[PDB]
Design a protein around this ligand. Structure first.
Ligand code: TGL
Ligand code: HEA
Ligand code: PEK
Ligand code: PGV
Ligand code: DMU
Ligand code: CUA
Ligand code: CU
Ligand code: MG
Ligand code: NA
Ligand code: NA
Ligand code: ZN
Lengths: 73, 58, 227, 259, 79, 105, 84, 49, 98, 46, 43, 144, 514
């Protein structure tokens, strides 16, 4: 029947707090990274990809031929 | 003029259980009833006016 | 225009509206993070039997949670104010158009050269042509040259209205006695829709705005034909 | 039996008759503006005056006659009066804001100028200046009244307070005559609007303050005030100084700068 | 003809969103100039730029109202 | 800003006061469980002996319960504290809450 | 500023009465003189039916609906001009 | 001695959940509500002019 | 210049105002206008809490500038202790006025 | 003096729970119904 | 908080009655108006 | 035992894990046997039997820590009842749809929507991400 | 005796009770108006076929919920019951003036109802902007009745503010400083100062609207040289402080509820909480023109109002984190009041953060007058002010009445309400980002799905409201009388029993100076 070792007995709440605040911070930076990938930069690239070869006269001629305008038939 | 405050102190401190707004005597009750009769009657009249004004009149 | 089940902003039609989309992305990330952190900290405070109920000293931690939010506000304000001033910066329009709000329709005036003006009314639902949009189409669209800087001047001849086009980032109140200026520049041809944005009475919901953005030479001939 | 110094008031009907009088006055104004009848309004004004009379009568009963105004209760009434005056200051601040908004940025309909085209303002050196000296003087004489009362001098208290009221009345008469003689009216655009609504509310406050001073005058004649306890007189003096200061701002802003 | 007019240029006297006074000033200026040139016999054509600017900027209904009041004797600005 | 050892020793001294009264016993225990710690065995020992000087068996049992409670999910703390208290429990004849059936819902 | 006189060794009723009769009421009497001197009616100006004046968006709730509350026929024209 | 929740809890949860799901599914799908979802991937575009 | 005719409080104050005024002149505080000054608060030197009945609520500001006040009923009988700081209070019921 | 204690410091009686149910029903129900009847009134005017 | 047992216990049946009456006091008058809306319009 | 309302101003008994030693004993009045138990308690506790120790504890305290901290089935009742009332709410919505709402506008008919969808694609509504971006103009179909 | 007690009251508890009953009745009116709103919008097309009536319903909904529901319950109801008890005072400073503050509200409410019954109602929006609210676009008595309703409610609250300020400054125990008063008392004092300063400016502006409508003034009429935008400044100079008035007593109650059910003797960081409410109150007077970013305002003005508005997040965040810190380490009691308070902390934070989005005037151009604003402020009002009200009502109901609620029914009620308000208002963010205007009776077809979900959510909250009435009935029907209350040593208002006697603190508390 060996004895039981002495465990930590003090500051258990404060230790739990510290551990999980640090964990919260790490998740926050993980989310900010993911969001910059899946949302922010995705949007910047969609707008940049769209306009890079965009031909506004060709867009107009397609709309005009579809019949959408009052001023252009 | 002479200072008659002591007489009024005696009257309004008389141990007769009356509230301050009636403790001057029977004139208080009359003036109270006049006020509350105008208020309640005027309030009923205003309800009638609401009734009239709630519908169109040609 | 908006499309069914849309979650965010209409696609940007002007470079300023594009700026606003990126600034909203930035700000919304911060909003999500802070609200997530609060929800999480709540759950963390509520999920232990460990207790500590004696008096807690506050001074240390109040520095953190004053200074960190102040920093975050500055990280919002700086791009915010840059967009604000960029919008305000001097543009040199090629064209000025006025719009007057009325109960309940818009009139438009193009008087740089000729006296061109007309009224713009919602198409009633029972008169929509097939495929047209309920509450959004008008009889006479605001035809405008695309890829050009336009000055819009906005007023009213009766109550307040407000002249809005979400995909261009535009909303300018229409106030009688006052002449409010805003600028408009479409990167693209097309049709761009908005709706009266200050309650003006019983047909507030039903005086929409439709811009028709076309090449300059089309705009010129349209103008000539509307005299 | 209580062992604090505060005043537990007897159950009173006047809160209710005052609330109803407010319904009858607002209802009455609606009826007057839109249904060509002054009946409700006359009843509400009547019940309002009756309510004020009996309510403040009872406060006099409670204090002079029954002794409920300990120092703690008096201290509370001082705060209450100060706070009330602050709220009246902010109310006038809204009309001064309206005045400066219109006059600092005169629209094209006015001619783009202040005073508007077609407005001929009163000369601020004539009756408006006299009005100013009248209220300023009344501020001197009511301070004399206050020191006389604290020094126990009944006759000079009454003389000074009577001079103060007389000046208040003189101001009201002068203002009524100025109103009649003015070549512009309340319907003369925003100049007439700001002029008459701001000075008109001020005039109403002069009438209210003069009435209050007159109440103190008759309480003094009946020996209610002691040389150390006379809060009704102090409150009427603070209110009177407020009315004076608002006049000075009106005089500088609307009559002088705005002319 | 020191122009080739497209629209009214930016005017540093009126740089903000409320353009009411820009409209009003150019209306006044045009009619003031036209009065001076019509007196001393001259040519109103020197007034043309003010005319173009206020026509570009000003709501039709304002011009129309201001024109009526000048004819009626009730225009409150100074010309 | 005192050390662990200074904290513990203040509390030992508190409960060891020979003429400690019942009010002081409760005040001490009710204050102590507000801190972010499970009290050292030497502190519990002094409180249990104070219970004994106050002829209060029931509060000695309740003290053992609150030790267990203050550990929360740290299931190893209470069995260690009882281990360290076994000679005192035996000496004073204090039965644990478990030996009394008082750990059953 | 200190006005241009002098006293504070004793504040009191006598001083404030002194101010009331020696400064305040004389000032009123002077301003009364000045006013009841520049009185006497001035010319009324030509009537011009300016649209920013004599506003009528709703009839007044008294009289014929067209007269202001303190209407003075001598100096207040109606929207149609001075009365007879 | 078992309280209300010991005796009826399981049944309240099960029947409440079952009723909730069934009636909202019915309301959502069976009575003609027009939800107007996205046409993307669902609508075949048709000539309009 | 000068004259009389204005009553004094000594002449004309009545009711509760007069009671407070007359008690203050005797250095007494029957209507609790003043804050009491604490004793050392030991068992031997407890704070003495006057009352016109057999219990009174005490608020204990245990340490200078605590924002939290500790409230409890003090009952006639043996001194009681603040449940936060332990300092002692004893009720002293009395008389008819305070 | 006035009655004190539970059920006595309120302007309505709680002595009978069914009479109370009726009163509460009239009280809250009248407030909730009023906007529906005001709308009805405005629709019936024209 | 602790409290005495109910002086006038409200059984499950009685609660069902109180709950039913309460819900009906809200639903019936508004339901009557809304159901007749078509009859109000067109007046 | 019996707590009375007119005792509100006196120290009271409570079971709270964070106030382990309440201000009074759970049981104040003692029978003849209970009095002798309390006398026995002044001698060595090793001579108390287990039942006597439990009786002592239950004189001092009402519930043990384990009793007072016990979890309950109340969540099942709360969650299930809330679902029931949310379910009842759908009944109200079925009623409203059946008796209050008329037909919605003709623009929601399938053929209208198909034509309006083509027109939105023709005017390239939201061509960067939102709508037309999701249409393949070369294959004439929704992007897969 | 009945009339003496209940019509002629001079007692702060009975008057608080009158306010709670009045606010509860108003809550029914405001809820029914909100359901009519969401019924009109719950499918595309028209339900009422009368958009002037729709506009009247929107307008009245707001006035009712703000002036007749939130302010009377929080300030008149909880403030009158609790403030004198929490400082050991025997009543309010002006106990008879207190009664007139109450009795001005039934006439105020009557005037509002009158406005909706005569002519075609006031279909103006609760902002009552001219010229729409003027005598040409809203001819007849309805708008003037609305103005007079506001005048009476304004006088009620100004006299109440004077009463609360005087009471809280002058009637504490002589040893208690202002920094020894509970946070709810601080929250009421600060709210009362904001009321005292802001309501007179509203009164000034709506009086000018009254004279423009009836005495031929032209403050807001360009034809006479006036300006509609002036009305907007005067209105919002009051209306922004007004939203801080609506939430501050809520913050006060939340601080007490979170402290209590965490088993704490005090809130974390007390002087920080005082500082935060005072800072909020002060900043709340210098930000009003963020309600006017589209009216045509110079750019530097926009930049200033953007920056000043955002600074309010700093003291507000100190309160949120301090509530979390009060929970930290607590012996958490999962009472229904605690659930309301925890929902408050989270949903108020969501709403405050979308406020910070709107503070950016560049983004606000596109969000202004859209459902994004509606979503924002129903998170701080219908999940902030209302959750604080429900929390305080559940927590203090046994104090006021002497009877307990059934906790299980109260948890069910919270659960249903939480689902309902979030289903109602969360999709409105989508509607706003995608451009749907507010104050609309119908919408372009693309917006149908979120409007449908939002209207279904409003029926779930109705079910919760009905259940709340039953819950109150069940408490009074069963009569479980309170016996014991924990933590009375730090919650003085409970220490005279449940309910306390008519007169409390007839003998004041004893507090030493040491
Ligand atoms: C936050 C309050 C509670 C809300 C609970 C009720 C609602 C449940 C929310 C349960 C989840 C809540 C988290 C937010 C959902 C955002 C959905 C989104 O995709 O939003 C996108 C943006 C616009 O972005 C774009 O332009 C790009 C769109 C890309 C779409 C790609 C395809 C998407 C597939 C379809 C998704 C359908 C989503 C339908 C959504 C249907 C909703 C009914 O919209 C917006 O900004 C909306 C503005 C909201 C401002 C307040 C934010 C505070 C949220 C608090 C969260 C705390 C942690 C969770 C908190 C966990 C819950 C306690
Ligand atoms: C209870 C009422 C209430 C409250 C408290 C608030 C709080 C705020 N509101 Fe809101 N608001 C309204 C009720 C309220 N609002 C109403 C009714 C309207 C519409 C009026 C109408 O037009 O009818 C409105 C409209 C409104 C507008 C005008 C939008 C428009 O019409 O275009 C704006 C703009 O700036 C605004 C901003 C804010 C901000 C910044 C706060 C701030 O006080 C919020 C601060 C709180 C937080 C930020 C959350 C907690 C903080 C943290 C967790 C710290 C960390 C955070 C950061 C670093 C950001 N509000
Ligand atoms: C020294 C004299 C003082 C003035 C006394 C005049 C009668 C006042 C009666 C009560 C007035 C109380 C409020 C005062 C408000 C001022 C508006 C009027 C000031 C005034 O008297 O202006 C007169 C117009 O009166 C008019 O229209 C109408 C006259 C009044 C009609 C009734 C106005 C009622 C308006 C009530 C609004 C009250 C809102 C208060 C809310 C308080 C906060 C809750 C000016 O006369 P004129 O002929 O236009 O020009 C003179 C040219 N010869
Ligand atoms: C038409 C409206 C007419 C109003 C008439 C003017 C107001 C008259 C007010 C009379 C008040 C009389 C009662 C009084 O003055 O009561 C005094 C208390 O002060 C007090 O309540 C002070 C009470 C507050 C008075 C506030 C007065 C202003 C109210 C104005 C209302 C409208 C204002 C706004 C309109 C836009 C009594 O205490 P003392 O004087 O110390 O006496 C005690 C000693 O004798 C003992 O030795
Ligand atoms: C926004 C809040 C409202 C939420 C939804 C209200 C839902 C439940 C309302 C039920 O109320 C009743 O519904 C009945 C129909 O089911 C109506 O009977 C009406 O219709 C009946 C069925 O045809 C006839 O028998 C009756 O004569 C006729 O008046 C009845 O008047 C109305 O009280
Ligand atoms: Cu025009 Cu809204
Ligand atoms: Cu704001
Ligand atoms: Mg707007
Ligand atoms: Na004095
Ligand atoms: Na609709
Ligand atoms: Zn202490």
């Amino acid at each position: 029947s060996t004895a039981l070792a002495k465990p930590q007995m003090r500051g258990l709440l404060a230790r739990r707090l510290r551990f999980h605040i640090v964990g919260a911070f790490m998740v926050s930076l993980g989310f900010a990274t993911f969001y910059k990938f899946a949302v922010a930069e995705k949007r910047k690239k969609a707008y940049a990809d769209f306009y890079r070869n965009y031909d506004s006269m060709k867009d107009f001629e397609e709309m005009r031929k579809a019949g959408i305008f009052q001023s252009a038939k | 003029f002479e200072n008659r405050v002591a007489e009024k102190q005696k009257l309004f401190q008389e141990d007769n259980g009356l509230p301050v707004h009636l403790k001057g005597g029977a004139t208080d009750n009359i003036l109270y009833r006049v006020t509350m009769t105008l208020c309640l009657g005027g309030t009923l009249y205003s309800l009638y006016c609401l009734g009239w004004a709630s519908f169109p009149h040609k | 225009m908006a499309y069914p089940m849309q979650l965010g902003f209409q696609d940007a039609t002007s470079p300023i509206m594009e700026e606003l989309l990126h600034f909203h992305d930035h700000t919304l990330m911060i909003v999500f993070l802070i609200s997530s952190l609060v929800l999480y900290i709540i759950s963390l405070m509520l999920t232990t039997k460990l207790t500590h109920t004696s008096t807690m000293d506050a001074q240390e931690v109040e520095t953190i949670w004053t200074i960190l939010p102040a920093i975050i506000l500055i990280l919002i304000a700086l791009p915010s104010l840059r967009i604000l001033y960029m919008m305000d910066e001097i543009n040199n329009p090629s064209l000025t158009v006025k719009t007057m709000g009325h109960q309940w329709y818009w009139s438009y005036e193009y008087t740089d050269y000729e006296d061109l003006s007309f009224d713009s009314y919602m198409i009633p639902t029972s008169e929509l042509k097939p495929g047209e949009l309920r509450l959004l189409e008008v009889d006479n669209r605001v035809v405008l040259p695309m890829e050009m800087t336009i000055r819009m001047l906005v007023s009213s001849e009766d109550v307040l209205h407000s002249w809005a086009v979400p995909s261009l980032g535009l909303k300018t109140d229409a106030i009688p006695g006052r002449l409010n200026q805003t600028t408009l520049m479409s990167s693209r041809p097309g049709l761009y829709y908005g709706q009266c944005s200050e309650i003006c009475g019983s047909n507030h919901s039903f005086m929409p705005i439709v811009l028709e953005l076309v090449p300059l030479k089309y705009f010129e001939k349209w103008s000539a034909s509307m005299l | 039996h209580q062992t604090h110094a505060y005043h537990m008031v007897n159950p009173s009907p006047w809160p209710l008759t005052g609330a109803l009088s407010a319904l009858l006055m607002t209802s009455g104004l609606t009826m007057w503006f839109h249904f060509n009848s002054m009946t409700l309004l006359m009843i509400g004004l009547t019940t309002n005056m009756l309510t004020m009379y009996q309510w403040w009568r009872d406060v006099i009963r409670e204090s002079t006659f029954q002794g409920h105004h300990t120092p703690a209760v008096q201290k509370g009434l001082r705060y209450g009066m100060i706070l009330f005056i602050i709220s009246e200051v902010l109310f006038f601040t809204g009309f001064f804001w309206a005045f400066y908004h219109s006059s600092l940025a005169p629209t094209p309909e006015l001619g783009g100028c202040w005073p508007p085209t077609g407005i001929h303002p009163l000369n601020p050196l004539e009756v408006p200046l006299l009005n100013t000296s009248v209220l300023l003087a009344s501020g001197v004489s009511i301070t004399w009244a206050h020191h006389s009362l604290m020094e126990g001098d009944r006759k000079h208290m009454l003389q000074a307070l009577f001079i103060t009221i007389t000046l208040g009345v003189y101001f009201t008469l002068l203002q009524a005559s100025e109103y009649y003689e003015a070549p512009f009216t309340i319907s003369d655009g925003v100049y007439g609007s700001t002029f008459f609504v701001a000075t008109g509310f001020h005039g109403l406050h002069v009438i209210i303050g003069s009435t209050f001073l007159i109440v103190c005058f008759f309480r003094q004649l009946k020996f209610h005030f002691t040389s150390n306890h006379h809060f009704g007189f102090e409150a009427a003096a603070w209110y009177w100084h407020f009315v004076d200061v608002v006049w000075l701002f009106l005089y500088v802003s609307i009559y002088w700068w705005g002319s | 003809k020191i122009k080739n007019y497209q629209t009214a240029p930016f005017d540093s006297r009126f740089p903000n969103q409320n353009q009411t006074r820009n409209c009003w000033q150019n209306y006044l200026d045009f009619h003031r100039c036209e009065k001076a040139m019509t007196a001393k016999g001259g040519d109103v054509s020197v007034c043309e730029w003010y005319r173009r600017v206020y026509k570009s900027l000003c709501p039709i209904s304002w011009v129309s109202t201001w024109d009526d009041r000048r004819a009626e004797g009730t225009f409150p600005g100074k010309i | 800003h005192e050390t662990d050892e200074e904290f513990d020793a203040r509390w030992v001294t508190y409960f060891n006061k020979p003429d400690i009264d019942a009010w002081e016993l409760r005040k001490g225990m009710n204050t102590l469980v507000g801190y972010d710690l499970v009290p050292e065995p030497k502190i519990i020992d002094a409180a249990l002996r104070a219970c004994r000087r106050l002829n209060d068996f029931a509060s000695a049992v309740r003290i053992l319960e609150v030790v267990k409670d203050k550990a929360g999910p740290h299931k190893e703390i209470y069995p260690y504290v009882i281990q360290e208290l076994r000679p005192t429990l035996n000496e004073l004849g204090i039965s644990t809450p478990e030996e009394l059936g008082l750990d059953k819902v | 500023a200190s006005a241009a006189k002098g006293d504070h060794g004793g504040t009191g009723a006598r001083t404030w009465r002194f101010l009331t009769f020696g400064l305040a009421l004389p000032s009123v009497a002077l301003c009364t003189l000045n006013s009841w001197l520049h009185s006497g009616h001035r010319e009324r100006p030509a009537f011009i039916p300016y649209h920013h004046l004599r506003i009528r968006t709703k009839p007044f709730s008294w009289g014929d609906g067209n007269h202001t509350f303190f209407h003075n026929p001598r100096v207040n024209p109606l929207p149609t001009g001075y009365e007879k | 001695a078992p309280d209300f929740h010991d005796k009826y809890g399981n049944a309240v949860l099960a029947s409440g959940a079952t009723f909730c799901v069934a009636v909202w599914v019915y309301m959502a799908t069976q009575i003609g509500i027009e939800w107007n979802p996205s046409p993307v991937g669902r609508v075949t575009p048709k000539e309009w002019r | 210049a000068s004259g009389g005719g204005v009553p004094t409080d000594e002449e004309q104050a009545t009711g509760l105002e007069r009671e407070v005024m007359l008690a203050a002149r005797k250095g007494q505080d029957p209507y609790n206008i003043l804050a009491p000054k604490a004793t050392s608060g030991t068992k031997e030197d407890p704070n003495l809490v006057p009352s016109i009945t057999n219990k009174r609520i005490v608020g204990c500001i245990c340490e200078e500038d605590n924002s939290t006040v500790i409230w409890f009923w003090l009952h006639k009988g043996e001194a009681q202790r603040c449940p936060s700081c332990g300092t002692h209070y004893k009720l002293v019921p009395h008389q008819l006025a305070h | 003096h006035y009655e004190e204690g539970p059920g006595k410091n309120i302007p309505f009686s709680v002595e009978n729970k069914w009479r109370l149910l009726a009163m509460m029903t009239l009280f809250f129900g009248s407030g909730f119904a009023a906007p529906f009847f005001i709308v009805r009134h405005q629709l019936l005017k024209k | 908080i602790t409290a005495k047992p109910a002086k006038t216990p409200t059984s499950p049946k009685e609660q069902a009655i109180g709950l039913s009456v309460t819900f009906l006091s809200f639903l019936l008058p508004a339901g009557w108006v809304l159901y007749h809306l078509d009859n109000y319009k067109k007046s | 035992s019996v707590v009375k309302s007119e005792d509100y101003a006196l120290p009271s008994y409570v079971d709270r894990r964070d106030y382990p030693l309440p201000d009074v004993a759970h049981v104040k009045n003692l029978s003849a046997s209970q009095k002798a138990l309390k006398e026995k308690e002044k001698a060595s506790w090793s001579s108390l039997s287990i039942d006597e120790k439990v009786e002592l504890y239950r004189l001092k305290f009402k519930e043990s820590f384990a009793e007072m901290n016990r979890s309950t089935n109340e969540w099942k009742t709360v969650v299930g009842a809330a679902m029931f009332f949310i379910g009842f709410t759908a009944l109200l919505l079925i009623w409203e749809k059946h008796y209050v709402y008329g037909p919605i506008p003709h623009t929601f008919e399938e053929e209208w929507v198909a034509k309006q969808t083509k027109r939105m694609l023709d005017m390239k509504v939201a061509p960067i991400q939102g709508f037309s971006a999701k249409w393949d103009y070369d294959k004439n179909e929704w992007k897969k | 005796m009945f009339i003496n007690r209940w019509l002629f009251s001079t007692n702060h508890k009975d008057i608080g009770t009158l306010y709670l009953l009045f606010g509860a009745w108003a809550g029914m009116v405001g809820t029914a108006l909100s359901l009519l709103i969401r019924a009109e919008l719950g499918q595309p097309g028209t339900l009422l076929g009368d958009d002037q009536i729709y506009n009247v319903v929107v307008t009245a909904h707001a006035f009712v919920m703000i002036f007749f529901m939130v302010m009377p319950i929080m300030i008149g109801g909880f403030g009158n019951w609790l403030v004198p008890l929490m400082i050991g005072a025997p009543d309010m400073a002006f106990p008879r003036m207190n009664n007139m503050s109450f009795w001005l509200l039934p006439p105020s409410f009557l005037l509002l109802l009158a406005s909706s019954m005569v002519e075609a109602g006031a279909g103006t929006g609760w902002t009552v902007y001219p010229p729409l609210a003027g005598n040409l676009a809203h001819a007849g008595a309805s708008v003037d009745l609305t103005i007079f309703s506001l005048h009476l409610a304004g006088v009620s609250s100004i006299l109440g503010a004077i009463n609360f300020i005087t009471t809280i400054i002058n009637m504490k125990p002589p040893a208690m400083s202002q920094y020894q008063t509970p946070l709810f008392v601080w929250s009421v004092m600060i709210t009362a100062v904001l009321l005292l300063l802001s309501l007179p400016v509203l009164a000034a502006g709506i009086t000018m609207l009254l004279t423009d409508r009836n005495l031929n003034t032209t403050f807001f009429d360009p034809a006479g040289g006036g300006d509609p935008i002036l009305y907007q400044h005067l209105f919002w100079f009051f209306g922004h402080p007004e939203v801080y008035i609506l939430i501050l007593p809520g913050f006060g109650m939340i601080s007490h509820i979170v402290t209590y059910y965490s088993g704490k003797k005090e809130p974390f960081g007390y002087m920080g909480m005082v500082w935060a409410m005072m800072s909020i109150g002060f900043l709340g007077f210098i930000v009003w023109a963020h309600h006017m970013f589209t009216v045509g305002m110079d750019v530097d003005t926009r930049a200033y109002f953007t920056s000043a508005t955002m600074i309010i997040a700093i003291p507000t965040g100190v309160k949120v984190f301090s509530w979390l810190a009060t929970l930290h380490g607590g012996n958490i009691k999962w009472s229904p009041a605690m659930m309301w308070a925890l929902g408050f902390i989270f949903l108020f934070t969501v709403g405050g953060l979308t406020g910070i989005v709107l503070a950016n005037s560049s983004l606000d151009i596109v969000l202004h007058d859209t459902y994004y604003v509606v979503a924002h402020f129903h998170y701080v009002l219908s999940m902030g002010a209302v959750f604080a009200i429900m929390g305080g009502f559940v927590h203090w109901f046994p104090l006021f009445s002497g009877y307990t609620l059934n906790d299980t029914w109260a948890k069910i009620h919270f659960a249903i309400m939480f689902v309902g308000v979030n289903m109602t208002f969360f999709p409105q963010h989508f509607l706003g980002l995608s451009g749907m205007p507010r104050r609309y009776s119908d919408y372009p077809d693309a917006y149908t799905m979120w409007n449908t979900i939002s209207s279904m959510g409003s029926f779930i909250s109705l079910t919760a409201v009905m259940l709340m009435v039953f819950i109150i009935w069940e408490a009074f029907a069963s009569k479980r009388e309170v016996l014991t209350v924990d933590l009375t040593t730090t919650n003085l208002e409970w220490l005279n029993g449940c309910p306390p006697p008519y007169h409390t603190f007839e003998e004041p508390t004893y507090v030493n100076l040491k």
